[PDB]
Amino acid sequence: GKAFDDGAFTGIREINLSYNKETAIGDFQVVYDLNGSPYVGENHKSFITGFTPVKISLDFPSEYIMEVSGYTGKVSGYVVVRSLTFKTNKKTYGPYGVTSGTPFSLPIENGLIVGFKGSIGYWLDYFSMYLSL
Amino acid sequence: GKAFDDGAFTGIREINLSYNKETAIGDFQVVYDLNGSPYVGENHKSFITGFTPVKISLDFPSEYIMEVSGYTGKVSGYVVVRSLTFKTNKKTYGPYGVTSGTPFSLPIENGLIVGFKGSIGYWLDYFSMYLSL
Amino acid sequence: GKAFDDGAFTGIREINLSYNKETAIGDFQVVYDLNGSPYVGENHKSFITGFTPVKISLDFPSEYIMEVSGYTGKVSGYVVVRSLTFKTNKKTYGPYGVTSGTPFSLPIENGLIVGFKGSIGYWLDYFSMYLSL
């Protein structure tokens, strides 16, 4: 898939993703916070279409992500990220996609998600998150 | 003067300033690195003119600041930044402005300057530096 | 169970744990690095006996944990950490315990595990990790 690295920022304001109820996560885009101003990140698009779009608008800076969890599984012979759930101090956003395969969970006790990197082919192959105080 | 806060970035690509031997620092503007992309910071201009312009072009990412030093002093009844010097792992930039008043020096053994904040009226009143690993 | 927090250190030299192949993880204690010298962290003991001991001795500083994986599951009506696996840049330690329940995975691309906190009843109830650059 096509690798991406948005790098590091000052926080998160909004997450825009797309999923298919039969496959996995396709699209991924973040409106990051940069020094008090919104910073529109690159749209990480899938190689295919037919995905349901979802906007996760955060009540920044009071609302922040405390946990990211989801599922990795096999879709057409590829291990991809099938499902994603964003849990804030105010609301649970998800699950988005297919909650099948192997679960993974990133609970945060101290710190914040400040960036995303990964890869997208037909679907979200994998992802990592930048953590900062 | 007018307070300013550029915030935090991935690093420094260029420092733009101005000075007058008879007074103090007039201009302050930073071209930061943001996840590999140069980012032009807000131009922190003096309320007046007659300054000698200086452009500090850094060989980013191999060249980075190891020391920020300078002098503070009274200019027209205001305590402002009279002189600035930037020392890297390659060369010394400055002194820019006269080396008179109270010396100040911030040498660095580990970490980097990732941002600037302060106030500019007729001249640079004060400044602070964001430090990160 | 009985809560514990070792706090932060400079690295990890050794992890001493115990498991019962029938139930979960029992005892847990860490020998940290503190500024180049070993620091024997407190022994976090299980209320019960009959666990198989394990010494995970790291080749510090060149060997460091890159992933902590395991399983969480129900043992006697309680939710506990049933097995743990430590993946370093040189070796793979484990799994130790029962590889049944809900899997979890914490891989690290950048940074280090510098400390541990958790709780021990009859078994390791839960755990958290201090991460630092």
Partner: peptide, 15 residues
């Protein structure tokens, strides 16, 4: 070291 600021990175999850 280099001129690039660093950050703790956790992951990857998936492929």
């Amino acid at each position: 070291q280099s001129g690039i600021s660093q950050t703790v990175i956790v992951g990857p999850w998936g492929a």
